[PDB]
Amino acid sequence: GAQVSSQNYTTINYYRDSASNAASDRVLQLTLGNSTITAQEAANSVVAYGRWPEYLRDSEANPVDQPTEPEVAACRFYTLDTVSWTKESRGWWWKLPDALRDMGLFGQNMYYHYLGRSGYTVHVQCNASKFHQGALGVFAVPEMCLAGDSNTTTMHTSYQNANPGEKGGTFTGTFTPDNNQTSPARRFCPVDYLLGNGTLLGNAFVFPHQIINLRTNNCATLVLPYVNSLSIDSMVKHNNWGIAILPLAPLNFASESSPEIPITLTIAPMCCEFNGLRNITLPRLQ
């Protein structure tokens, strides 16, 4: 029993284990549940990795009990807070599913079960006039890990500072190490041009992304499937996605020295399901 291939040559497997073997576009409308969105200046939309969200199949299900699928009660658009873009802004970040932990019945289902999974639709809104200039880069990062603020210890960020919620965090232009040994702050110090994790910002376009250019469009839409090394996981311990918004070109208006415009985010869970019902979790978030 020998295998003949071309380079011809012959190979034989000696062991029983394979390990041993030698090797139009501007217009958009979205409807989820009882919520709708319209857009008249869009740059199309992005589906991350070309994969649409879907439910978990029988041939890939780890847990054995019957899952819960709220559907319209939780698969709907939630609007977070609105941030202000000025000439001194460096960028903002959010974690998913951390930013929806207090959003109607989605948060209740999240905190009542032990396992959960879901995809997302993210819609970023920012409008200005024909006399404004600027550009924003919106990136979706799987496993968005940020660096700490300590040069004497590593991986010492507290659970509270890493989960800000719907308010999110911001990037900074400089790295400031914390020197309080008695009362360490235990928080991230993400630098903008390093993307907060030691890699150059210019390469962040490897991740799913879009660009809002004030002279072209005023909104961005990203469709994120569920990504993880497991079929289903704990939503309260682990964040699946991170959203990062950074000014690629600074904001400017006519000759004013202090222009400002708002930026709003709307996120919708998709195909979300849960397992392992028990008493509700009461985390220490302060």
Partner: protein, 60 residues
């Protein structure tokens, strides 16, 4: 919308079924039925209030 062609904005039109407190912040109104209106070439928006009742008819 009856502004200039040089104006832009986005609005939120919301309907909430009865039983709870009337919304007074976008945070509360965002939980009921709603539409997001983007002001562009089309200067009008329509929001449909569906029939959600316990009785078959309502009094006038």
């Amino acid at each position: 919308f009856c502004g200039s062609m040089m104006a832009t904005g986005k609005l939120l039109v919301s309907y909430a079924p009865p039983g709870a407190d009337p919304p007074k912040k976008r945070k509360e109104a965002m939980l009921g039925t709603h539409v997001i209106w983007d002001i562009g070439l089309q200067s009008s928006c329509t929001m449909v209030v569906p029939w959600i009742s316990n009785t078959t008819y309502r009094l006038t």
